[PDB]
Amino acid sequence: FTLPVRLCKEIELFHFDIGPFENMWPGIFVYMVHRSCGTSCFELEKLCRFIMSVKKNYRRVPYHNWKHAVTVAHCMYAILQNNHTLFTDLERKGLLIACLCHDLDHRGFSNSYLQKFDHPLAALYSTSTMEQHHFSQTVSILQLEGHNIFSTLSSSEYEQVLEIIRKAIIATDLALYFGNRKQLEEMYQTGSLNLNNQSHRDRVIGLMMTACDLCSVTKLWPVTKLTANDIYAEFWAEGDEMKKLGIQPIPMMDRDKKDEVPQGQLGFYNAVAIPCYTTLTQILPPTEPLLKACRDNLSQWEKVIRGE
Numbered sequence: 001f002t003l004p005v006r007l008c009k010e011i012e013l014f015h016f017d018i019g020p021f022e023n024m025w026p027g028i029f030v031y032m033v034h035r036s037c038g039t040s041c042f043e044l045e046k047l048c049r050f051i052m053s054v055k056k057n058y059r060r061v062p063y064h065n066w067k068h069a070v071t072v073a074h075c076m077y078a079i080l081q082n083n084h085t086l087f088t089d090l091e092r093k094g095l096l097i098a099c100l101c102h103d104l105d106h107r108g109f110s111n112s113y114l115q116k117f118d119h120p121l122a123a124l125y126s127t128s129t130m131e132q133h134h135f136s137q138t139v140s141i142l143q144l145e146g147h148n149i150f151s152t153l154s155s156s157e158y159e160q161v162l163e164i165i166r167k168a169i170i171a172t173d174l175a176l177y178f179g180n181r182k183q184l185e186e187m188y189q190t191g192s193l194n195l196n197n198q199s200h201r202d203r204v205i206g207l208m209m210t211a212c213d214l215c216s217v218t219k220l221w222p223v224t225k226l227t228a229n230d231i232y233a234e235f236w237a238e239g240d241e242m243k244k245l246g247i248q249p250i251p252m253m254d255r256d257k258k259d260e261v262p263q264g265q266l267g268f269y270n271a272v273a274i275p276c277y278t279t280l281t282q283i284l285p286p287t288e289p290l291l292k293a294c295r296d297n298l299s300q301w302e303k304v305i306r307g308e
């Protein structure tokens with residue numbers, strides 16, 4: 001497989017939509033891997049077995065699916081390329097694998113669901129429930145025979161890459177974004193943020209995981225609109241099951257209030273999405289097309305509320 005040349009320069013666009021090229025997404029990740037880290041950074045043998053076993057371990061849920069992991073992975077690719085100068089090979093290796101893997105085996109279900117009804121995984125993992133599991137899956141497949149793509153790493157360089165991926169996967173729990181984005185906002189406007197400080201890198205990386213994770217709000221409006229169907233299809237199913245017992249789900253998961261969606265978008269943009277890309281853009285000025293595309297979509301949703 002080789003990427004049809006009519007992309008190449010289209011893959012480098014922040015707003016790039018992977019949708020129409022489903023049979024290609026395994027080759028795009030290889031492509032995004034090949035371009036970034038160089039080719040021979042893994043054995044092409046064990047990157048494919050890895051890619052394809054990550055794949056098959058995504059469920060046929062409407063949104064937290066294979067298509068989404070590739071959409072997050074792609075967005076890390078675009079962020080990295082435009083920030084070539086200031087990440088390391090061991091980082092640009094783990095972060096792309098971490099993005100492809102960060103929702104592994106998702107069930108179409110919130111952490112709040114899995115705890116409010118004694119779900120066994122929340123018995124395992126009491127905080128960051130689904131995200132501690134995604135990392136769990138990642139480690140399993142890695143250790144499966146002929147799948148350790150990090151075999152060509154020294155001892156202390158292998159346990160390094162594992163840490164980055166773990167941290168990045170955990171940071172995709174939106175409940176930790178809010179504190180992390182606010183810690184990041186203090187330092188930059190006190191002036192005290194130091195990219196040499198390892199723990200600051202972790203915050204920065206965490207936010208880059210957050211920005212990638214929500215990046216269907218940074219696409220061209222037609223694409224960003226259709227993705228929203230998939231997000232609510234899945235919220236509405238989680239609410240439908242909170243309903244089956246007799247419990248009224250938050251209006252975000254209540255299908256009986258689709259009417260309320262464009263308002264909830266705008267507020268979600270104004271409370272989650274715009275602050276995140278706003279911060280990422282101050283740390284990483286090249287990521288500003290993400291912020292610009294987020295504004296554009298927000299005003300789109302405002303026209304939807306305002307009758308236009």
Ligand SMILES: Cc1ccc2c(c1)nc(CCc1coc3ccccc3c1=O)n2-c1ccccc1
Pocket residue numbers: 213214215216217228231251252257260261263264265267268269271272
């Ligand atoms: C009736 C109603 C009440 C609240 C709604 C709402 C509708 N729609 C939302 C936002 C739902 C949503 C969640 O995760 C995403 C992840 C990536 C990209 C977009 C989204 C997204 O739109 N919210 C919301 C969620 C969080 C904060 C503010 C609003």
Ligand SMILES: [Mg+2]
Pocket residue numbers: 064102103172
């Ligand atoms: Mg998730």
Ligand SMILES: [Zn+2]
Pocket residue numbers: 068102103172213
């Ligand atoms: Zn996700």
